[PDB]
Symmetry: C3
Subunit: 118 residues, 3 copies
Amino acid sequence: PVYMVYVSQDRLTPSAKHAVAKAITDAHRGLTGTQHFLAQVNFQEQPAGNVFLGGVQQGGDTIFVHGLHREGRSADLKGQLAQRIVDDVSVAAEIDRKHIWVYFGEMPAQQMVEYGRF
Amino acid sequence: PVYMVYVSQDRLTPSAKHAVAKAITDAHRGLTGTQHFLAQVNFQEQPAGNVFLGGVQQGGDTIFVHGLHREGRSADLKGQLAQRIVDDVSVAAEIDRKHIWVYFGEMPAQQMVEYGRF
Amino acid sequence: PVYMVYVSQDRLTPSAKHAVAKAITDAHRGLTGTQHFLAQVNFQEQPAGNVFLGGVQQGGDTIFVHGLHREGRSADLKGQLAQRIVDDVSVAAEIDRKHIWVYFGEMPAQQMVEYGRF
């Protein structure tokens, strides 16, 4: 899978980025059984002030995780995975989980290429 | 919902970013009935020259809005919402709406976490 | 369609960005029959060190192509298109295709606006 993680510049130090990537990657392996190296976490940083909630400009605390997954998992499993990402990123980023948004999009495996192969 | 708004650096001043966020957020509330604070607008800025149309490098005017929505709305309603975003962002960004692209992706509610809850 | 291309800053020169955009755009026209000017390629650059694979921080070689398409094409056609993007971006970016990931998401045409029209 690919987890696009949208954060404000300077909110996550390199150590914190590694910790957040580990939290997400461990949650995905542990709950779905997929191998480690298949989980990409891709941080997309923007300057603070680019996030609006209800039209109101925010500081730099929002973390939006957009997970791009293969179709075929149960709703219960996807909910457990989203909840684990919230809990574990809250620990890893030392952040109130009110700041964490997680959306999963799914795709047929036949239109997903990882490491240059299907 | 989350609206990822892809723009070129310097095309939108902070005032214009606030106006565009307000246009999108107001359109989403008004047409779907969802509450204000649930609408995130997340601006993703890149240097001018990173956008190609038909292989041709563009200036800094393209605005691509990628809305990430819960499934369950009618095609007519989604079309009205997309059209309103085009019209209202055209006003808010003082931009020819030939420059505005809007795509909506949808997801089951059970795999969407906002503010740390489902 | 819109192809969001996630790369590390400095991996692609402007010439290489043009070559990669041409590879993707030509593959989409040639295989699907859509017109040239309808294909947007939008490069999203981030500093090297923002990509993790299996929790391990990478250099600047990963290229993730997220294609946003209209629904309605066959699985075989989508697979041929993904494979062509891998091959042709490998040539255009002078890069081992082990570094190239390609995911396609699809949407009803009625919720896709390009150039300010449906």
